[PDB]
């Protein structure tokens, strides 16, 4: 029946983070920075556009629940103004597109809440989750879920291949995208899962 | 409490077409040609990149059913090779984006079967349905449905505004896109519906 497709660091649990609400500002291992508009610098600091992992643990000040999975989430934060472009995470998989298969891609998407000393996390940039083969977006969920301040929700993306799909044999891939359509312009992702089932 | 947002020629019934499977090759009334990659020329023939309306009535060569709604559908056909770009239909509405409102866009999407002038309609280019405010895509369904050869299915796109949405007061819009990701690379749309409801 259903087969689980392996993904590296699928719940962003590497690296380990000791202190609740702490976070890194480098690309998490197993992933790459999707950067089509060059918004995220090679060298990041507290003060730049950045991505990384963050510990959403007991006593977090910024959510009304914990990480969907384990300790950590993956986040993308953009400093540039709304409409400047998009960025996020990308992972190309070893699995290839096979014919007469239903693919289901699930990812949790989180909306950071609250304030800190004049800083405000109110609002949300929009998200898109993409399933790729090669560099083709086969299917994507472009911001269809409403995500309340301080909660996560599961996005579901589906593609069904045919006997004669043009992209057959190409490497499957995943992209988790910050749309930068409004601010606060950070968002969190967690618990990436991909399954495949013969139609 | 649910309110219908008016759309012009929402079912592509204008213009009336007398003979089953006959069609126009010009932009349907009430719509514009979405053409970001310049795939569709200003003057069209049968078999050039084009769009139009077609009559899907009793004894159509292309479906196992009649049009989702009334007589007609709106089609977009792209002659160029896969990867060349996208094109379709756009309509800017008079309604504007309002706060704390749940928007639901539904569109029927058709995978043509059969044969036409000795060409197989086997295969499908992929679709995307978009809800806009101004020139921003608020939410979109990028090709998540599996549509069998010779059937229509309903795409649903949803967006929820907040009190402080950046695009509040901007004009709502709809785009119906042919993705040109595979061949046969034409597809049909019908029965565009958009509703709004206070959250
Ligand atoms: N879940 C995230 N995306 N990141 C971790 C929580 C927010 C993160 N940690 C903090 O302590 C607050 C201080 C204000 C800025 N913050 C941050 O950027
Ligand atoms: N699309 C329909 N259901 N009916 C109209 C068929 C004709 C319409 N116009 C054309 O020029 C041909 C090109 C190939 C596909 N076409 C079309 O879809
Ligand atoms: Ca996790
Ligand atoms: Ca927020
Ligand atoms: Ca119709
Ligand atoms: Ca077909």
- Ordered DSSP codes for B83-121: TS--EEEEEEEEEE--SSEEEEEEEEEEE--SEETTEE-
Kind of pairing between the strands at B151-160 and B72-77:
unpaired
**Dihedral, CA of residue A140, residue A144, residue A147 and residue A153, to nearest 10:** -50
Confirm or reject: Cβ of A188 under 6 Å from ligand 1.
yes
Question: Known binder of ligand: residue A176?
Answer: no
Tokens of A128: 């898109």
Q: Which residue's CA is the closest to the ligand 2 atom numbered 10?
A: B46
Query: Residue B64, annotated ligand binder?
Result: no
User: Could you give the CA distance from residue A22 to residue B38 in angstroms, rounded to a whole number?
Assistant: 48
Nearest CB partner across the interface for B144, out of A139, A146, A182: A139
In eight-state DSSP terms, residue A23 is: B
Q: How far apart are CA B88 and CA B192, in angstroms?
A: 14
Q: How was this structure determined?
A: X-ray
Which residue of chain B has the CA closest to A102? B146
CB B101 within 8 A of CB B197: yes
Is A141 strand, coil or helix? strand
* Residue numbers in B near A126 (CB within 8 A): 138
CA distance A29 to chain B (A): 28
CA distance A14 to chain B (A): 31
Site from A103, A139, A149, A199 to mutate, B interface, most B CB atoms within 10 angstroms: A139
- B112 CA closest ligand 2 atom index: 3
Listed in sequence order, the residues at least 6 apart from A186 whose beta carbon sits closer than 8 Å to its beta carbon are A75, A76, A77, A78, A112, A121, A125, A178
DSSP 8-state secondary structure symbol assigned to residue A49: -
Bridge partners (DSSP) listed for residue B88? B34, B177
The verdict on a CB contact (< 8 Å) between A181 and B136 is: yes
DSSP A25: -
Cis ω before A96 (30° cut-off from 0): no
Q: Which of B83, B137, B183 sits opposite A142 (nearest CB)?
A: B137
Report whether B78 contacts B170 (CB < 8 A): no
Of A25, A54, A190, the one to substitute when testing ligand 1's pocket (max ligand atoms within 8 A of C-beta) is A54
Tokens 């003979």 map to which residue?
Answer: B19
Q: Is the CB of B65 under 6 A from ligand 2?
A: no
Number of A–B residue contacts, CB under 8 Å: 74
Domain map (residue ranges) of chain B:
1-199
The answer to whether the Cα torsion of A54, A57, A63, A66 is positive or negative is: positive
Distance CA A72, CA A14 (A): 8
**Of residues A82, A83, A142, nearest to B142 (C-beta):** A142
Give the angle A161-B50-B152 at the CA atoms, nearest 5°: 40
Rounded Cα distance, B69 and B11, in Å: 7
Which chain A residues have any C-beta within 8 angstroms of a chain B C-beta? 82-83, 102, 122-124, 126, 130, 136-146, 157-160, 162, 164-167, 181-182
Q: Which atom of ligand 2 is nearest to the CA of B55?
A: 4
Chain B nearest CA to A11, separation (Å): 23
Is A178 annotated to bind ligand? no
Alpha carbon of residue A35 to chain centroid: 13
For residues A77 and A185, give the distance between their C-alpha atoms in angstroms, rounded to a whole number: 6
- Specify the length of chain A in residues: 199
Task: Tokens 């749940």: give the residue.
Answer: B102
Q: Which residues of B93-119 are buried (b: 16+ CB within 10 A; e: fewer)?
A: bebebeeebebbbebbbbbbbbeeeee
User: What one-character DSSP code corresponds to residue A6?
Assistant: P
| B124, B138, B182 ranked by CB distance to A143: nearest | B138
Resolution (A): 1.9
- A87 near A100, Cβ under 8 Å? no
Q: Which one-letter DSSP state was computed for residue A40?
A: S
CA distance A94 to A96: 6
Q: Concatenated DSSP letters for chain B?
A: --EEPP-TTTT--PSP--STT-B--SPPTT-EEE-TT--S-SS--TTSSEEEEEE--TT-SS-SS--SSSSEEEEEE--SPTTS--EEEEEEEEEE--SSEEEEEEEEEEE--SEETTEE--S---EEEEEEETTEEEEEEES-S---TTEEEEEEEEEE--TT-TTTTSEEEEEEEE--SSSS-EEEEEEEEEEEEE-
């Amino acid at each position: 029946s259903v087969v689980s497709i392996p993904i590296n660091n699928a719940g962003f649990e590497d690296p380990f983070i000791e202190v609740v609400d702490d976070y890194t500002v480098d690309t998490p291992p197993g992933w790459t920075t999707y950067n089509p508009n060059n918004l995220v610098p090679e060298k990041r600091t507290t003060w730049t556009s950045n991505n990384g992992v963050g510990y959403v643990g007991p006593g977090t000040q910024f959510y009304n629940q914990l990480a969907p999975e384990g300790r950590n989430i993956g986040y993308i934060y953009l400093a540039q103004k709304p409409g400047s472009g998009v960025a996020g995470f990308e992972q190309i998989l070893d699995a290839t597109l096979e014919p007469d298969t239903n693919y289901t891609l699930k990812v949790d998407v989180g909306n950071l809440a609250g304030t800190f000393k004049g800083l405000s996390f109110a609002g949300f940039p929009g998200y898109r989750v993409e399933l790729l083969a090669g560099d083709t977006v086969l299917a994507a969920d472009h911001n269809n879920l409403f995500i309340k301040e301080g909660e996560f929700k599961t996005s579901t993306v589906t593609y069904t291949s045919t006997a004669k799909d043009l992209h057959l044999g190409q490497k499957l891939g995943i992209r988790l995208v910050n749309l930068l359509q409004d601010k606060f312009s950070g968002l969190d992702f967690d618990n990436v899962r991909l399954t495949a089932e013969p139609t």
